[PDB]
Write a protein that binds this ligand. Structure first.
Ligand SMILES: [Zn+2]
Ligand SMILES: [Zn+2]
Ligand SMILES: [Zn+2]
Ligand SMILES: [Zn+2]
Ligand SMILES: [Zn+2]
Ligand SMILES: [Zn+2]
Ligand SMILES: [Zn+2]
Ligand SMILES: [Zn+2]
Ligand SMILES: [Zn+2]
Lengths: 389, 391, 390, 391
């Protein structure tokens, strides 16, 4: 009876949610600027009696949607994403993610009055990163994920597969501050912020010999001075660093901090060096929770492929350090589909992409059913995760 | 006899008219090659006194040549008019005074020019502070415009009154590197790194400073150093000055900086561009007999001409001095503590002393032109001295 | 009806004569291209068994080719002898055993060679550890010395017994910069700075690392960086390595480093030299059917052939493997916890276990060559498989 | 007087004895702190004329103090003896002449010292060309050795005869980086790279040159930059000069270079050492009236004292000028085209003109000492001018 209601609702109303997906696809908004997308999803949740908190952990366009039955049972959380890319506009198919997670939440809410427990959608802006990007990183730090017990989600891809491993990433600004002087007449009175920057860059080049092969550090000079006749008192670069784990990355980023400090000391300058967004973490996978995903991926008619699909780089990792989380992919077209391409945006607004949205909503809604209904399958997952972390 | 008195009577009779022009250009500072109001205001005043006007000279829209010919034999006495402001500072070099002084000088001498013969010429010279397609006089020399005048006169407001200073040679240059972008994490091995090319160029310029002469300079900034942290740059852009005592010495220096760029390109597998954004300023060749003539009338008009080390300058009027006897002197507009390109200087350029400098300088120049036309021995001597010093 | 049995009877009856030779080479370590005792001791043993000797091969004074031809049609089976030690460690790679075992294996097969036809050849191969005019086998390949053999056999002592490993391509390079001196305080404007050129080269090499493949390496030191603080250096000298997975890839990587040097010279107005101080090592091309032959005899001789990731090597025997089917297998001389190029390894190259590994290797190689000559189908298949792969 | 004539008669009637001492030193050129033959040959001549000798001064084995004391009140007149040669060049600074002249001057004045009072002192000053524990006179000043003398006299052979030139302050510094080795192919990630530290220090010094005064210098070389290409270096070693107009300025400059090293260490994770390999050289404080006394006697002895710009020097005699009135003049030994530290200058320093200069300088210095002891008003005037000028 319980599975019937959830599927019936999603199947008779599919076109309504598919429509929300194209409406968001047509209006690509970048991270922390996704006003249309968050409102549209908030409305559908409010239309089905969800209690809405907006503006979460410093993210104006984030939300927490909640429907609580008032009965003991797990709080099953669905991660909604809805940010596009600059120039490419939804070439990661984030129109599907937010709509799929909302449709699944609302699908499950249909029976939550009966099974017990709670349903929650977390609207998570800026997953692609940037200034105050990676909202889920902020949520973990703010304690927003103490509100859920399990974090569900699906991502569109070139195939259907279980959660991939993911990497830790920092996005960092480097700034040097000196003292300007006319370069021809009195450069001996200057403290050269550009010499600091060049020296920092020489140092980062040298570092690459001595970091692990899985690690990355790359960046650009955003402000290199403005007048050729005047010694710069300010320069500004932006950098990424990347490691397999947060523990490893914290060590790696401190090495780069020290290259900046050293450059500062060489040149008599002062400096700032720090994150422009809360750091992204590696995924801690719960295999029994992906088993559950595969099971319903198959029951819904997808071939879940076992293969190396590479490493990801997503703030959903951060949520997996707190609670059992998934970040699987649903096929939305050719196996030659590559994320962040024009052909991938086209794919996210196609009939296959529309089908994946509905299949994703069904899969998640039915996992939520089994986690609240079953206490042995739920406890297996919770105990597995807490052992792996 | 009385031809000197007509010049002075004209200049002094309607001096306040010209002071107003100075103040109107001061209120509305315009940058190099953008001096629409200044050029037009000065062109209208020449046109009001029957000068034949040519506009848009040597690729400079806001440049002009204003000629009054008597139709009789004699020298062509040129007056250099400058009228560009500085960014954020707005006539902190007092160029409102220079253009107006030269116009008023030319028009003073114009009063008498039908009696004494020869020809008066105002050359409107924009963008002397430099920049993209800056230094109009450099373009003028190159285009043949300076063949129209026999002598080139000018005054420059300063912290004191002094004869022409030595000036330096300058190039202003763009360095651009061109590569092949790639995603930095995933596939940096199929990129050609234009920022690496730039850092290598910068490292090489630093090294070069050990091996250049102590009178030479090389300095610059990175205008484009990449835009996305996750993408390898395929384009970087820097802007540089190079300077030396002479144009001969500078062409050697700039070429060394060229090869530093080239080498950076070779190291990184990138391609490159390296060239001047403007024509290129030359060192002054001074004609001491011409500065003697200035000092003479500087004193007659009541200025104390100081003989001290007032440093080197760096002006496209040096380029004109390679063609014809040229002066680039200074007239006091206030405190000896006045430094050029400061807020105090801008305020000084609109004071009563700057207004007075303007009138005195016009008087000095008009009277030099009277004698250069009138006294053939004094003219011959200046022409021959200059010719010896360049030739 | 068994020529196999003569081979083993010879090696087994006078094995102690050969174990002596190994300990004599071991007591007297000689660095690459200085292996006077080793080369002569081995040459004297070959002369004792009717081998014809040519010495000084491909510009290597301590190299040789010992041939014994039956005069009958058949494959020329080559055995590689190595005999160079390391500075300070002195045979912590166990090259005392490699050269002895190959000479013993070739003399073992010589006992039967007049009957089965064909030819036995031993290539004395100095300086495999590398250095200046190092990697003798690289020179042999380039000199056409390997046209004289049809198959290249060898054994190396190791932490266990296994088949040929994959190896990597290496270049060993000199960078020299040539400028013009002047007094640094007084007239540095008349100088061309060979040290600024060097610093600029090093800065460029650092940048290169972001853009090379993860399996590749470039690393070096400054051997001459100027002598007087008050004189602008007119000369600087660095030594570098470059490494890739193939020789085709390494030629590209080394040329990138060539252009980094070249760019540095252009920046500073200096001149430059950039090139190898030794010929240059190549990736192994393995012939699995030849390693199979090894494993078959390895097991007949009592050894356990292990199949595991034993990592990558870097040896000039790879260069040989581009010309003819070649092996570079390992024979157990002690604990699995043995590491190459260490003090514990040198002691193991002269132990009872290392002695056993010599005779076992010598038997394995002699029997392999017996089969390569005798079995045309096995020979044909190994030659054709190598031919398809290269 | 009869005293003045005893002095000159001594120097003239056995000048060839001392010229031979100059040639034997020239024949056997010895580097700083290694001048065993020169110091001993000089010490033996002073021993012969009843001078008390102390050897090994302020940590310099080839240094000596040779004292002849009258036991009567009077100034203690110091004669600075130099005798170090250059590597590969022999005596291309003419130091063979310097020490012999000062010994012959000291001994000439010694003839009369028991009659006029006071004291004669020769300081044997090794390694003035510098290097490891170079510049003995820096060590002497620092050790209190110059409290033994009231005036310091000296002559230096040159292309002409002239008064003490201005001299510069110098530091010779070693830079060492300490890290942690690894196999470069395999384990680079557990290394700390002392060569990257050195490269980074050099890149930093290159950048500094834009920002040091035009009279300042910094230059060095890498003496150890690693030894095996397959191993990340755990040790590098460089040697540097820094230079400035004054010690006050040079300390600021040298500290800037220290911070460049510190920063390189911080970037690479290395440790470091930075410090001088010799006592630092200081700028000359000149006493004009002492040079006037030199010029007086130079002229008497047959020399033309030329007033002209002969550039800046760079010598540890400068250090002595901070304590007592000192001269560092030059005496002509050949063509005006002679340049120090060349083969021609070595050739000059053994020539007849060089021998003549030795005797003349000896005479000049001994006649200078006679007046300094004898004339209290000339002495006092020199002491009070030095005291004023040093501050
Ligand atoms: Zn994405
Ligand atoms: Zn995504
Ligand atoms: Zn367990
Ligand atoms: Zn200006
Ligand atoms: Zn101006
Ligand atoms: Zn080895
Ligand atoms: Zn080996
Ligand atoms: Zn010297
Ligand atoms: Zn000297």
């Amino acid at each position: 009876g319980e599975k019937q209601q959830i599927l019936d609702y999603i199947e008779t109303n599919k076109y309504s949610y598919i429509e929300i997906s194209h409406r968001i696809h047509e209006r690509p908004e970048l991270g922390n600027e996704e006003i249309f997308a968050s409102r549209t999803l908030i409305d559908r949740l409010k239309e089905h009696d969800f209690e809405i908190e907006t503006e979460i952990a410093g993210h104006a366009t984030g939300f927490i949607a909640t429907y609580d039955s008032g009965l003991d049972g797990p709080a099953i959380g669905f991660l909604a994403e809805y940010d596009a890319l600059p120039g490419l506009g939804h070439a990661c198919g984030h129109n599907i993610i937010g709509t799929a997670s909302v449709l699944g939440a609302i699908g499950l809410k249909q029976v939550i009055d009966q099974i017990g427990g709670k349903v929650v959608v977390l609207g998570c802006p800026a997953e692609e990163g940037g200034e105050n990007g990676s909202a889920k990183a902020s949520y973990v730090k703010a304690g927003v994920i103490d509100q859920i017990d399990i974090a569900l989600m699906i991502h569109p891809g070139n195939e259907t597969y279980k959660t991939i491993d993911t990497l830790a990433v920092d996005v960092l600004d480097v700034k040097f501050y000196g003292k300007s002087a006319h370069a021809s007449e009195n450069a001996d009175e200057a403290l050269n912020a550009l010499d600091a920057m060049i020296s920092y860059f020489n140092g980062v080049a040298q570092l690459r010999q001595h970091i692990k092969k899985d690690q990355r550090v790359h960046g650009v000079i955003l402000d290199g001075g403005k007048a050729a006749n005047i010694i710069p008192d300010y320069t500004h670069a932006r950098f990424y660093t990347r490691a397999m784990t947060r523990k490893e990355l914290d060590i790696l980023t401190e090495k780069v901090n020290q290259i900046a400090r050293g450059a500062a000391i060489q040149t008599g300058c002062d400096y700032e060096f720090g994150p422009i967004q809360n750091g992204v973490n590696e995924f801690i996978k719960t295999p029994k929770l992906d088993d559950l995903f595969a099971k319903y991926a198959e029951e819904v008619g997808e071939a879940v492929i076992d293969d190396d699909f590479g490493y990801g780089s997503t703030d959903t990792g951060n949520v997996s350090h707190v609670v059992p989380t998934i970040h699987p992919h649903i096929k939305i077209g050719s196996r030659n589909l590559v994320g962040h391409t024009h052909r991938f945006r086209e794919a996210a607004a196609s009939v296959h992409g529309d089908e994946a949205l509905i299949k994703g909503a069904k899969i998640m809604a039915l996992m939520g059913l089994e986690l609240i209904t079953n206490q042995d399958v739920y406890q297996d997952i919770i105990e597995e995760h807490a052992h792996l972390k």
